Amino acid sequence: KQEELKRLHRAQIIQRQLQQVEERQRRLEERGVAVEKALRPKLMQEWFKLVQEKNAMVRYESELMIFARELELEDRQSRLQQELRERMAVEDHLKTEEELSEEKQILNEMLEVVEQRDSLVALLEEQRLRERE
Amino acid sequence: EELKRLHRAQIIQRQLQQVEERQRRLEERGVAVEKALRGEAGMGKKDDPKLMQEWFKLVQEKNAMVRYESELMIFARELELEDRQSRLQQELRERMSEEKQILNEMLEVVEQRDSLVALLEEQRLRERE
């Protein structure tokens, strides 16, 4: 329960930031429309700045996507781990051939959740080492 | 792959080295600017508002580097844990006794990684605000 609360809070923080990003992109969309309507000097210069600012927001949105997926995966993993801890309260000799292979299937699900998670951390690592430009 | 992971580790060790050096250069500019602020480098310098301005830019640039150093720390630990995890998983996916203990070591490694991701998230979502 204390594990699951620190997670809900991180999810809200992320939502709140995606909402702020959406809105900042909405303002840039409108300035962008006005600048392009004005293309019937300083005006061409504004168009390039808007492109930069939209780019920045997209990079920020991307990071939030990654964090939000990683968070979904922590949740799935935690639940699979619960399903597995429950099954391991019973000694192994007291289980069927079938019961034992469901334990092995749960464990595979959990390992491929972990693999996806590590793949998203590697991508985020790449992005943070690339943003030092 | 163990060599993907190796390569990512070398990248990180090398970026920490570039960071340590960028901080060394900033230490030196910082020392010169402060010698100039105490009127020791040129009798005009101390009156120039560009000089006070440099001091504040150095502080910002030092702060940026420390944020970067922090991120590299986290990534490097995470990477060690990814390595440990993948090896414990390999040990386990070979065996299928100490089988139940290996699984527990791996679940603790997974929990520590969750925890470093959460810390990284907190810091990245505080560099904005």
Numbering used by the authors:
A (entry chain A): 1841 to 1880, 1891 to 1983
B (entry chain B): 1843 to 1938, 1951 to 1983
Paper text:
Rab proteins, the biggest subfamily within the superfamily of small GTPases, are major regulators of vesicular trafficking in eukaryotic cells. One such family of effector proteins that was reported to link Rab proteins and the cytoskeleton is the Mical (molecules interacting with CasL) family. The results show that the domains probably constitute a Rab8-effector family involved in endosomal trafficking, and the Rab-binding specificity can be well explained from the 3-dimensional structures of complexes determined in this work.
In order to understand the mode of interaction of Rab proteins and the C-terminal Rab-binding domain of Micals/EHBPs, we first aimed at determining the structure of the RBD of one member of these families. Mical-3 folds into three α-helices, the central α-helix 2 and α-helices 1 and 3 folding back on the central helix. The asymmetric unit contains two copies of Mical-3 that form a central 4-stranded coiled-coil composed of α-helices 2 and 3 of each monomer flanked by α-helices 1 on both sides. Interactions between the monomers mainly occur via two hydrophobic patches and some additional charged interactions. Additionally, even though all Mical constructs used have a similar molecular weight of ~18 kDa, whereas Mical-1 runs as an apparent monomer in aSEC and binding of a Rab protein induces a clear shift to higher molecular weight, both Mical-3 and Mical-cL run as apparent dimers in aSEC and binding of a Rab protein disrupts the dimer, thus not leading to a shift in retention time upon complex formation. It is however not clear at this point whether the dimer formation of Mical-3 and Mical-cL and the disruption of the dimer upon Rab-binding is of functional significance. The low affinity second binding site of Mical-3 (KD = 4.4 µM as determined by ITC) could also not be detected in these experiments, suggesting dynamic complex formation with a large koff.
